[PDB]
Structure formats: structure tokens, C-alpha cells
RNA sequence: CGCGGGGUGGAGCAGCCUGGUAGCUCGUCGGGCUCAUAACCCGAAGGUCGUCGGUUCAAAUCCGGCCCCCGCAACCA
RNA sequence: AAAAUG
RNA sequence: GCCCGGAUAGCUCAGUCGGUAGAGCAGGGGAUUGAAAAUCCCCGUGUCCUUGGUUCGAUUCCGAGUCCGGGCACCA
RNA sequence: GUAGCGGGCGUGGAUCCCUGGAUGUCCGAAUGGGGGAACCCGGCCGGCGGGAACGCCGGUCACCGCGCUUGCGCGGGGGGAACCUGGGGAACUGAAACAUCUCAGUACCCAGAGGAGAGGAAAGAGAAAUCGACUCCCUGAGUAGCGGCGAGCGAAAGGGGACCAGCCUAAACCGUCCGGCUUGUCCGGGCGGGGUCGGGGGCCCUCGGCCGAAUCCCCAGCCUAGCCGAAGCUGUUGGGAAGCAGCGCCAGAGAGGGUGAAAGCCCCGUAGGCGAAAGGUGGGGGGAUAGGUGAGGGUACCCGAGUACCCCGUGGUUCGUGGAGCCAUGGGGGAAUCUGGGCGGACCACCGCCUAAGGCUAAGUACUCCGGGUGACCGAUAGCGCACCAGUACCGUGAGGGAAAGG
RNA sequence: UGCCUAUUGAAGCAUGAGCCGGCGACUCACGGUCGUGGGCGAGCUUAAGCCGUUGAGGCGGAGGCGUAGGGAAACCGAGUCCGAACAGGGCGCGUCCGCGGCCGUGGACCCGAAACCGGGCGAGCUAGCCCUGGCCAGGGUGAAGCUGGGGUGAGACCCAGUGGAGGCCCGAACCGGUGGGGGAUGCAAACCCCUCGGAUGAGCUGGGGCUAGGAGUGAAAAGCUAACCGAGCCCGGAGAUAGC
RNA sequence: CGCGAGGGCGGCUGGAGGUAAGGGAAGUGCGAAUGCCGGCAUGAGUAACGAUAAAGAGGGUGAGAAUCCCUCUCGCCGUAAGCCCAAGGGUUCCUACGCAAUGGUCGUCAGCGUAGGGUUAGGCGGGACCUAAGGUGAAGCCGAAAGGCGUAGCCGAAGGGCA
RNA sequence: GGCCAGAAGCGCAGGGUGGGAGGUAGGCAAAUCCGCCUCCCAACAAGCUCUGCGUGGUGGGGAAGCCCGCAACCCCCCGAAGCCAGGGAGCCAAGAAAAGCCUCUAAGCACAACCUGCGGGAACCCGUACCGCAAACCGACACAGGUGGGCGGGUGCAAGAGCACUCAGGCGCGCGGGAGAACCCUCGCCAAGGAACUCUGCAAGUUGGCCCCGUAACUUCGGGAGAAGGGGUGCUCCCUGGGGUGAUGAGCCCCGGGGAGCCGCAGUGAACAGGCUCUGGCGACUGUUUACCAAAAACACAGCUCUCUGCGAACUCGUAAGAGGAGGUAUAGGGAGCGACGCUUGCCCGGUGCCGGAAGGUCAAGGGGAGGGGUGCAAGCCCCGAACCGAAGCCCCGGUGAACGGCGGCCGUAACUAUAACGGUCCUAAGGUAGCGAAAUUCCUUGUCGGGUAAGUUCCGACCUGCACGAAAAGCGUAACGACCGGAGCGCUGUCUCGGCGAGGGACCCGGUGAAAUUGAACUGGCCGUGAAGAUGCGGCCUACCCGUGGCAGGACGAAAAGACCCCGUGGAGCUUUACUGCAGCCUGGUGUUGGCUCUUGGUCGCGCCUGCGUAGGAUAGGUGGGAGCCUGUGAACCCCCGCCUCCGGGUGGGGGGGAGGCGCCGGUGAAAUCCACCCUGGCGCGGCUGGGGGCCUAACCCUCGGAUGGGGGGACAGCGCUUGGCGGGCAGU
RNA sequence: GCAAGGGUAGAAGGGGGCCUGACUGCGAGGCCUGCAAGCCGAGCAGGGGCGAAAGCCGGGCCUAGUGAACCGGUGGUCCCGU
């Protein structure tokens, strides 16, 4: 949907199998349909000033580490690029 | 013409695919109660199971043949 | 506080 | 095909962390009753599924066998 | 583009052809704002007309992304016949029905790249005391395998060739500048130095020896106009000789076209050989910067994290759940730094291979808008839809469709 | 008793053809299998590429057939497999070109669908809705209200007059389309004449806007969505597939 | 001359290419696919000539006129079949010459052909004014990419406003 | 022919508007401007403003008339849909925005700037021909079609934009000329008869305007009403009543009334211009619909009912953001069915659906690990995996009909017979009530009676064995309405017996221009046969000079559409469902986002003490083991008050007096006691680790709050990611 | 044993005693036949039964009582096992 640090979201398939297991008798497959795995997003408000990121919430922590950096710069309204960028 | 359901004591229903035991209510018959009739009470009887045969040790029961009984279909031109 | 007809 | 509970009086079902076999109903004998019920009494009958083994002994405890009932999954 | 007037210019070297420059309305990424493209309306500075109203004229004013104290300086935007990479991604059909499968990761849509794009220096391959970036071709091989084990799909290693190339960083460790803080000899942000690995690097003591750009330059050479180029006369039939008849000749040139018909020697040419003030291009051969140059002995300081790894859901591979690894990765859990970590088809144990989680990297390869050359290629119902004033006329609201016609 | 086609059977009243002239259909690539014309033979043969040529051909053995077969395999071997077996029984000997026939994969002898799918173009027709404007001659009926009179204890209510209501009436414009005739290679790809319905309303109409293809809109017929809509048009997949 | 497909000979036409023996290659042979493209036939001098509002005559011009100009009669529209404005259309406007074709006939005519003219605004209508629906769109929100919403602002008229 | 324009100033009509004087929690405190309060005056005005109309200095224009070219302009009457305009009254559905324009203060400035006057100047861009209800636009055409707005004269008729004629202005429709047949179209008339026509009075006719009489059932009371059925209408002359403008008298128009008298076949003398009635069906009604075969009894409709929805509503669109719902809030929104109004709307929850049920049953991940397996020398690394704990769903229990739906059979019976109020029995979840009823429903069927008719498969009234009505897919009625469907009458008539005549436009002839489908080739006859069974084309026979023109339709299996019916193809589409398989969507557990603090109860391994009342028997012996040859004192023997087991018998610990005491076989019992153990059964009590359920809070997340580094509300839930299972024709492929 | 047919007492019928050949390895030669299936079968080997023996015995008087492959399940074993 976005990603911030991390990165985007794949597009998985499917498996409708109706069968034994291969540990009794065979096991056939009903249908493959195109699924879409959205990237478990989630939002973060942070103190750098009054900032907001949309961390892939598996990296939420990275938000802070990135906050744990006093790059020495007053207002700019966003000051995210530096953050989200002078990041790594 | 074709399907499918059904003929069991007097009437109305079981029992039949799971073969040997015919069950129920009503009424018929006898005896009580009552002045008497009902009602109520006690006790009995009564069926070639539609027919003509087949298979079987044994056929209401299973398989075919008609006889009436009941239902459902009989559409396109 | 009470179980039809002739 | 796996996982569960089962088999006890005619019938429907109980139960000790081994010591008797018991209820409810049907059924029969009696009282009471206008009638028919409901009440009230006394019973009646058991290989506790079949086998072993456990124990001094087993309804019961465990192995195994057959019938019965419940639950779940397959099906080329 | 010839046909015409009407005028003119050229050996005082025109026209023409190559190179560079100049001017280049308006619309179009369109960029002052608007807008029904090619039109309308404005800010600021300056200049024209008597010029204050009006009106011309020249500059200049989009937005977005990177780097300096507020202004700035570099960049971007759109287009391109295919070819290329990525992100998305069908059905018809096939299976003589059909759902897995097939067609197919194709058609198409989107973003991006460029003369190519991609890939690329091993956490590789796979059984070889082995190999040694990648890409392309030939094999390997319709093999191995995959598969309602149907239809059907289908590798890789190894072997031949083409090409040939290797490299920077992150972290230890040292210095420096800056802004925060619990004003602690501390925390992290930015530069510089170091350091790049199958085993190395940092830091301490012990011994010091050069190759070389993928970037900058220069010339060659090659494009972009051109010049030189051999050798035949007479007669004859004919409307017209290049034919025919008789004597010749050139040839590094007997390719071709053209001239009234069939010419080596008529014209343009052909073989062969010269040419650039100018602008492109250009290691093919050479110059110069950048950068890179050793061996032992000790700590046990560094070696890329929400990563590996395990689990759930999927994709790629010949692999369709299979005994199913490996490579990718949305979700959850979640390490270690060489007594580290991955791989060699579940899992162990041996044996061996390789160093993940940062990046760049020529060439050989693909394509044909464009220029040239050939054709047991077409010759005007063919060949391109167009040999001609065609993507036109005409048709359709539009997307779009789409002729005929040569002598 | 025509030609062709299709047929058990056609002059056939079965299909096709007006006539002529052009265009018009068994191909090519790669595998494979027979046959055949050749080279060479226990052997035969090169791929890609390098070198020359500029309509010279060389080189190149990686590789590929063939020389041994049996067996699922281990494995063995002129044998082998099954088996205890010295029974038995099943299997048990060429390449490279060219040309031809036919097979496999490619449309693959040639035309022809109805349809499926992707991406765009369309509401200048038609349906709905939104903004802003217009339009509806003349007649008719005569609601509520007011006002006056009457009525009653007060009221209700009743009366005249006034008044002018309404998916009200007749009927033009305007909108529509009932019945009939005509029209039927039309004046016209829906028209003309007569006759009909509505006509202050759920009205009609100009201009400016919005909604779209399994979607829109729909006082609902599967109607309308640019003259054929039970799923638009255009281009593409595409030479879909066609046991006809 | 060949069984035949064809092959030679000869005569007119034509006027610039052609191609032996013997061989090799194919876009290689048509009468039919309601085939495709073009040409020309049949029906056929047939149906039609587009509203039943209607014509007649005298002069003109002219190569030639029922069909053009003029005149006098007759008839038809007259909430039009008449005037004015929007839209759309783009020179069809006026003038001089003209008739091949275009007019369903004719044509001296024309809305046709060639040429030359013609459109004049502070007050009319638009813009250097205003907003509507709705568009667009700094911010801002959202989407795999395209892109979807959207504040302000801007655009948008037959409505407001102005001599 | 007797007008047009025209400033200021005059008049005449209007439209706008109270004037004061003080205060002030508002207009995002800036206004002396608004807005609100308070009190002197004033009031169906005046004044002040602003329009329209006349008037206006003055300019302009100005026919019919001959040769080929002359110069007024006044007076009444009618009179708007236009103007004054933002006028008035009434009503419910409650009726744009912004700028210009006034006014108020801000910043700033007052040497600016505005306001009124007067003179000089300045004043860009675009459109402007022409067609424009059509031959110039849209329809391939010089197409009988389509196209928005304004003006649109006069007379006549009740009125009018109607109808007839006609001004101005413009047309006579881009082939003509003759004939004078059939037939076709369009049009007129008709003896006698009058629906006999025919599916049907289809069509055509009759009637038609206005004034006056006069009009029934039925009714929701409005209406049925133009009900029906009649009479009048022209022209001349006489008298007379009110109106409007004048002026109160005259012309001028506007509505009437009463008498005479004239003419025709006829007076709305032509054109416009209803025929009517009785009775059924359906639908309440006006409306809407299949553009191009269906205008309806179909859709809609007010109205009734069921149902969802508490607001960040439900529901719809969208992946999302967001939007619609609605700037609404249950007297509101969404979905469904029925369909004004009247009288009503029965019985059945067995099966399906929906709603309700903190129990049980079953149940996926996941939790859990008894136990087993593969490996190594090992520790280990890996694997399978039982109990048990586990949602929604389903099973199960129950409600529910204006939820889907459903709503019986066979026998007998009365004192003539008939029939059956009564009875018997089988089945059911329950057995169709009211009202209708051979019906838009009835097969038999033209049912059977009545009515209507000379005659009636239709129609109307009746009766029921209702093949197969019936209550909200409503039932039965119903005034009014209908281009709706059926049956009758009257009137009128060519629809008809039965056809005839006449007019025009074609057809026909001449001149000019000149198509189309179709077409194997044609030299293309009849009858009998024959043949693939319907022959111009074979056979036999029979007829027949050659070629045209006007006409008719029997044939050429005539034309046109590769049959729409039927079947076939392992063709296609749309639709359905409890067909298969999916997907959207919705439900659901486990995780992530995700945090504090309590309460509580489970399951687990520990550990800590109890726990165990057969029959003999010192008596509440658990089990086998060790056992001699056993321990109290810090002191038992006995005692009380006490928490605790239990069946009571019989106990498990407390404490002080007290102070000696106390054992092991015993004798029996299947088995023997002191004490130590390890352990079976069950319970209790602290600890580990996991769980579940209840509350409280805030800080994430969410919603809001005069613009918040915040305050309220909600709150670890919701939402969202990943994963589990389920529902699932809403959609897709088959 | 059960449908019909053919066959049959010089037994295929009825009874009795011992048995388990309702074997393992094979299989000449044929029947039938598109394929692939189905059917008969002497004989050899091994190790057995019944009979003194000759001998008979690879199910049943005979013809129906059945289903390719693929995919799996249970066993077993000389095989394979990246």
C-alpha cells in the first residue's frame, strides 16, 4: 500500500486442494486463484517534532533508531527525508 | 396405449421388500346394570386374504396372467 | 360443597 | 478406514477407587372404586456378552473376540 | 516542380554540393495564467508614438528532485520502427466434453533504460585428486525429469566456439568540524585516512622490492563535398546505327546505365589512384594522470540485522504436494562474527564447496526508423495500403476504416 | 434428358453459376519412415566457429548414428531373464548427401461462424439525474376561504353573494401515436391522410453538465445505451475452433 | 507433326525484346467456391421523373427556349408557404462573363464553372466583470504502475451585471 | 394618406423606504456599520429617492395619382400576455450563487487618497457576407421527415394563435403534351331495404356551435350530465333597461329585453363542429411502456403490512481514500409484497428460511505433549504423535405465515323412495373458513334450467361432482375514470341484397431523361403416361403461320431470405437451482499492531501433610518392601476448651495440668501393626510454567472539540495485516 | 447346489475311509480372435495325497457368478537409493 523503510507487497496465488494427503492415498487440487498479500502496514507518530510514518510494523523499531539521531535541525514542517533518508 | 398404488372377518385401516406368529377401531352374538332404552360393564364368534398357477419344506408375504378400484402423464407440428 | 330418552 | 461409549431382570438404564446385584416400567395377587384412571401393599426372574489371565476371590481390573450404538475423514 | 509573362544575376566566378554560424511567428513536454492545440488575459524592469490613460517592442516569471542561510547552482518533464528490463497480466484454443493442466508468463497495459538493455566476479556448480564472473552460438538433449504419469512441458553439469576484466565500499582503528546532552574525557551526524576477504582486515613489535586504467589527452585511420582516369575510323541498309561489311585499338578498365535499334574504345561511368580549411568519429598504435606494489610473531578489536535461521502463505526451476532441497518472500518468532554462517535434493553423521544480508563493471548478444550493396524477388488485380500530390479521397460522433489511379 | 456438386438414385421441379477477363487452393521448416540416385564402408559424418573468397572453397571431431544383447535394477554377457535346476520358455547384428511417397509439430489444401478474452472510443441518438432559461389561445365547472342573513344558551350547521381551487372538463399551439386506408426497389431504413389520447402537470422544451459494456439508465419491455443490444462499437489475441 | 496436353509452318498486326540442346528451381495450368476485382449485358425504351397550390398569352434575348427576363391575366399560402433572432453551415452574398458536368426534362438559368468585389462598432453580442451544475486543481488523503478522491485557487452561461 | 425619435424642465401613473436619542455578553471584540434590547415623537402619509408614460427646443419621415416623377400630419373607440415591478391576494411542494453596487472600521496615510463640478484628452481584442422550419442545418439526394426563440394585419363566427376569405410579403412545389379503356388511389351521389355484411357495424355515415327548456337509476355525495329528449338561430322596422369613456347631454364601443313584418328546400344557410343507451369483465383513478408489429387487464400510483437500521445507521458504489444515505436521526432511511376506498383476510411450524437459545454433540488452525521413530560414540540435532484445552458453522432445544410453503380417503345411516343432519374407520403438520364459482380458472361441455332472439357453441340470471377458485403471487364488492375486452337497443348508413353513375391523380398515346431484383443456355404448347415418386426438355398422341401491344394471375415446385419449425454438432449464448467447482462478500478462532492494575477460577510437573470406616478381629489394616528383635523425654499415662476427617461406630492437629509412659510377633486374619521407604486413590496448602473467564484504568489505535505541543468520548475492543474453518447463484467457469 | 441347454447310471448320481493337487517352477501343441482379452492343455522338475497296483490329483458334469490402465493401501524381498 506503501512501505516506508522496508518495501511493498507481493501478489500470491492459491490452493484449493480436496484430498487424502499422500499418507493414505493421493491428493488433488481444485483451483489456483490470484491472491494479493497486502504488506501488514500500520502507522506511527513520533517526537522528532510531530512526525508520522507508516512503518511496515515489523520494522516499527527502526522508527525509533531513526529518531535516536539528533541530526541537528530545527523546523521544516516535515524533516522526514533527512530522517527517512539520511537514514540508510 | 403407458406408468404406480391398492383388493385381508360385516365397515374402515395394519401385517407383505425383512416368507412360518393375521393386529386395531367399529359393528354381530351372550350375560349384567335400569322400571326400560341408550350409554357403561363382562364374555364370545367370525377371514377360501380377488382370481387362474409358479418357486419353496412352507406363500397374506416372492415371481408372472387377466378381473374390477384409484391416481399421473398422453407434449412439437 | 353434587359423575340422555322414553 | 481411525477416535470415542457400550453388552446387567421382559423392557428402558444404574454401581463400590475387588466383597450384595440394584431402580423405573411392563406383568401377576390384593384393597379401595358408579365407571376408568391415579393412589396404596407383597413379591416374581440374573452365566452381570464370550474367552482367558490378574487376585484368596472379580459386575467390576487388564489382555483378546463377537454383536450394538455414537463421532470424524476418505473414496481410484 | 517551367509554362507564361515581368524583371534580373553570373569567369569582377553565380547557381549548385559539404561544414559551421545567424534569423527562426504561433501550438505542441509547453513551462506567467487561462484554453474548446495553434487563441485569449496578466506581474515586474526597460524602450518606442505627442504618450497620463491606449497600443505595440525586448527581457523575464511552471512545477518536481538533488547540493550552500534563503538566494541560489546542477538535473528532470516529452518523442522514438523494432529490440531490452521491470511491474501487472487474459481468453479463444489443446486435452477430440471439462474443472488440474494447456495456450502462456504469450496478447495487451504500465514504468524505465539506451545505442543497446540485461547480466556479471561465487554464501556458485556437483562428484570430477575437479571447475573457476557474465552473456551469445553449437552440443549435451527431446536426455534428466515434470505430468488428471493425460494432452503435453522440459533442464543443468560437462564439451566445442565468440568474447575476455576486473573493481569500489560498510565495520574495526586514527584525526577533524559541527549540534545535543544528565557539563560524563560520552552519545551520533558529516567529511578525510585506513580497509575489502577464502580467509582477510584492525591494532602492537620484526624484515621493504612496481604494473596500470574502463577517465584525460595527441596524432593516425575512417565519415561528412569532390578530382584524375585508357582505346575507332570508313563504308552500307535504315526514319534513326551502337546492326551489317572492312581494316584497327585500350584493357589493373569486357560492371552498369544512357544515346532515334544490339557500342569495351560516343556520354556518365568502371579498374586503378588521388582530396579537406571545417565538423563529427576514433587505444587500431602510442603518451600521461587515477590507482595499485612485501613476508613472520602476538591480542583473541572488524568483517553488512528485524538479516540469517525456524514456522504459516506463495512464486521461480524440469519439479503440478511429491521423499521436495535450493533461490526468491507477505506474516509470526528471531541469532551468531571464523569454537562464526550457507550449500552438495527430507533428516542426521561424516567428507568437501562457498563466504549471504552494500554498489559498479567493457566486450562477444538483440533490433532496423535510418545509409549502402546484392537477389534461380514482384513488375501496376503484383510488389508496401500508397510507383501517381495517400494514410489522401471518401466513410465513421469517435476510436477507427480506408480506395482507385503508371507508359 | 445440359455442366458441376451432393446422392441408393438427378434432365431433373435438389445446390452453384448472367457473360467475359484477370486474382484464386496440398506449401515451407524441423523431426521421422519407407523407396530410390550417389559417396564411403567397420565405419560413416560434422555442428557452431576460424581462414579465403566477394556468386572459390577450405579448416573445424565437441557431438551424433553404428559396432551386443538380456534384465525394473544390481548385474552379466553371446548370452540373459524367470527359476532350485545341468527342465523348460521369452527376448538375441551399417552411415552420409540428393530426390520421391506418407506420418508428427507447426495455420498447414482454401474460404466461412454463432462466439471468448485485453486495451481503448462512444450519453452531438436514447434512458435518468443536476444547473439555468423558456412555453401552455379561448372556453367551461365553480372547492376552501372571506361577507351578509338565518340558527343556538353558545354551537354545530344552513343559506345566498363574493371568491377562483383542481395529477378537473372541451379544445388550439405543444407533446403523443388509438383504428383504418395508402405507402412496400417508399417522399421516408417507420412516411402521408383521415380518426384518435394528453394538453397547470408525475407537463413540454432550449442551453450548460454527469452516469458505460456484465457496466450504465430503466413508472420494468430484457426496453434504451449513435438506423439489428438476453450483453455496444473499434483495434488486437487472430489465420480462434469448425468431427460441418 | 503428336494418342493427347501441345509442338512447328504460313499470312495479316506489332515494334524491342527473345532465349536452343541438356539440366536445375518453383507464388506453375481455373468453369463452377451465393468466390474476389473490373468490364458489359437482361429486365427496358419498361417503372419512375419526389406532394393534385394551376395555369395562359403577348413581347424580349438567343445557335437553340413550355422551362431565362419583362408585361397582362388565373390560381396557392397569409399563428404562413410572410418578416426578425439563435444554432449549424462556411462564400452558398453582389457584379461580369460562361454551359461540359451538376439540376431527375430543358436551359440562354442557377445556390453550377472562371474572375473581381463585399462583412467597418467605447454604447449590439462575447472577452481585459460575476458566479451555477460541473470541471480543474497548489495543499492533503488513497491507490502495484497508470491513476482515484480533493481545500484554497482557477475555469465554466442562454443566469447577474454594463453606456 | 392622416406618424416617428427626442435631452433638462414640467406634469400622470407607480416601486422603494419610518425619523430620533442612548446603551450592548454577537457579526472569529478592530467599526460611530449591522444585529439585538430601552423611550420622546411618527404612523391606512409626508418627505426623500428611483423607474415607467405623456410633453417637450428640435430633427426626421411623408400615397394614391398621368407625362415620366406632387408635399398634410388632428379627433374619438377598443386595447394587452408588454411596462410602472421588487404591485396585490391565496396556497404548499416553501421556491440559486457571486460580482458590480452602498455602508463600517483595519493595516497604512493624511504634501496621500477619495466626493461633486467644469474643461482637454484616452477608449484595445473577437463576431458582423449569405442560408436559417430549409434546395445553403440533421436526414447518402434540389429527400412530402426532424429543428429552439420573437413578430405574426383585416372582416366574419359566443371566444380564440380555431375555421373561411384576404393585406403586406411570398409562392404555382425543375418534365411536358394528349387521350378519356380495364384496374388502383382519393372524392361526390344513389331507388327500395336497412347490419341481411362480417371474426367485429372494420369502414363510412348520422350528431355536431351558442341560447332556453328538460333530464333516471346508482353515488364515495363531487358526480353520473353535454344524461337522455326537445325547441330557438337569418333579414327589416318599432319601443325600451342598465354599462365603460366622455362630461352628468352628444358621437364611441359593451352586455340585454319586448312587438310587429319579409324571403327561401334550408338562417351555426359555406368552413371549424359529440351519435346515443342498456348491460358484463379487468384495472380504482391522471399517469407509464416495448424508438421501428404488442399502449394492455402489464409498470407506476396514493394506501396497507412485514422487515432491517441508535448514527462512524442500515444499504449502494469504490481495492482504497471517499462518496451517496443526509448537512437526515425511527412521525426518519433501506429492502420486500399488496395496491384508492368498503367488508374481510380462517387452520397448519412436520420439511425450508429467519429470529432466539452463555447447556450439551461435532468442529480447523493453534495450545498440549503420553508415546514412538531416523540418526550419531555421545551429549544432541531431526522427525511423526495419544489424552486433554480449542470459534463461527452444523446437530440439538424453541418461536415464527401480510416468512417459502401446505390445507385428505373409503364405507354406513331417516317409517315410499331419494338424499343424508348422525355414525364407523385409515392417514395428516393441518385437513380449504368467509366469500365466489362451467369463471380471463370447467376437461366431459354447446353442462342443466331461466332470460334475450323467428333462430343464440357468445352474452345475462340461476344451480355447484370447483378435471384444477379462495383471502395480501390477497378474497368478495365498488360510485367515478378507460383510444381496454364481451353481449344487446335506438339512430344512420353501400358494410350488404347488388351494383350503377360521376370528378380528380395514375394507368394508356406522343416528345425529353431513364432504373431494379432476377438471369446455366434456350429454338420455352396440351393430354395421357413415364421418370428420385407433381416434366416445355423422355414416350405416344394432339394441337399450333411469323412478331407484337393492353390486360389476368394457374404454372415455371416463380423471386426474396445457405428454414425462424424439427433433428444433428461431444456448436454458442441469456437465465435457474438444495447440479460441480470456484470467487466477491459476510461470520469466525489463532497471531501482529497490543499497554497498565486487580479478581477469579482451571490443567500441568514439583514439593509440602492428610487421604483409605470387607466378615473374624485390641479397630476408620491401602499396596507390596526393610524390620527388630522397637521409641518417648524438649516427658507419654488421664484430663478439658478447640480447627479438621466420618457412616456412626471410629478420628486429625492445638494446649496446660500432669508426669509415667510407652513396643513386634500376639490368638487369629488372604495380608499385621514401633519406625523408615518408595508408591497406588482422593483431597488440601504454598510455589514454576501455561489457560480460560469478570471488572477498573489510558497512553496506543478511532470519533469528535470556537485552529488542540491539547480537552472531551470510545479503548486494547473496534479497524487493519497474516493465517483458520464456515456460509455463500451475489458472480464466474462448466 | 441356482436359468436353459448338451452330457451322464459301463456315473458326472447316493454313501463311506483316509486327505487338502482350491500346490510351487513351467509349459509342447492348439481353440477362438482386429487389437487385448478368454479357453483347453500333454509333458518335465520339485516336494506331496489316495490306491496293493495300473493310476488319478494344478478345485467344483460343463458352459454365467465379472472390470484395462492410472492412483493408492497392506505386506514380503536378491534390486535402487543423488
Curated annotation (Swiss-Prot):
Keywords: Ribonucleoprotein, Ribosomal protein
GO molecular function: structural constituent of ribosome
Keyword Magnesium recorded: no
Gene3D superfamilies for the chain: 2.20.150.30, 3.30.160.850
The keyword Ribonucleoprotein is assigned to this record: yes
GO cellular component assignments: ribonucleoprotein complex; ribosome
Classification via Pfam families: Ribosomal_L28 (PF00830)
Intrachain disulfide bonds: none
A GO biological-process term: translation
Entry-linked InterPro entries: Bacterial_rp_bL28 (IPR050096), Ribosomal_bL28 (IPR026569), Ribosomal_bL28/bL31-like_sf (IPR034704), Ribosomal_bL28_bact-type (IPR001383)
Coiled-coil positions: none
Binding partners and assembly: Part of the 50S ribosomal subunit.
Family: Belongs to the bacterial ribosomal protein bL28 family.
Protein name: Large ribosomal subunit protein bL28
Native source species: Thermus thermophilus (strain ATCC 27634 / DSM 579 / HB8)
Lineage per the UniProt record: Bacteria, Thermotogati, Deinococcota, Deinococci, Thermales
The gene coding this protein: rpmB
